[PDB]
Amino acid sequence: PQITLWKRPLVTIKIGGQLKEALLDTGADDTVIEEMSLPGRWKPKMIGGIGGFIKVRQYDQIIIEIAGHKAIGTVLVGPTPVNIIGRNLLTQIGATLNF
């Protein structure tokens, strides 16, 4: 699809068996999801943005379905105010910015 930027680029994702709404976010290196359980190993990480840093759990090799496209990669889980699909998964679905 071509997604307009008149509105926030929110899509439906499926992760860990759960449906969520998330932003397609070219400004985020990595994907960050609000608190949820994921299977397997994780390690702690600090990620920062406007307002400072939050602590997250880094889970590697997690499958997401993003607007119907499957992608695998790292997912950071923690107290983000919005679910963010970052570049590590945007690349895998072939997303580009065009103007």
Catalytic annotation, residues: 25
* 12 is an interface residue for Na ion by CB under 5 A: no
Kindly list the residues in this chain that would bind its own copies in the complex (CB under 8 A): 1-6, 8-9, 23-29, 32, 47-54, 67, 69, 79-82, 84, 87, 90-91, 93-99
Q: What is the DSSP letter of 51?
A: T
Q: Quick one: tokens of 54?
A: 């939050």
Cβ-contact 86, 71 below 8 angstroms? no
Q: Which of 3, 60, 63, 79 binds Na ion (CB under 5 A)?
A: 60
Half-sphere exposure for 18 (CA within 13 Å, toward CB): 13
Distances from the Cα of 40 to the Cα of 5, 16, 22, 43, 54, angstroms? 36, 11, 22, 10, 21
Closer to Cl ion by Cβ: residue 4 or 98 = 4
Stretch that binds Cl ion, among 13-21, 38-46, 51-59, 74-82 (CB under 5 A): 74-82
* 24 is an interface residue for ligand 8HD by CB under 6 A: no
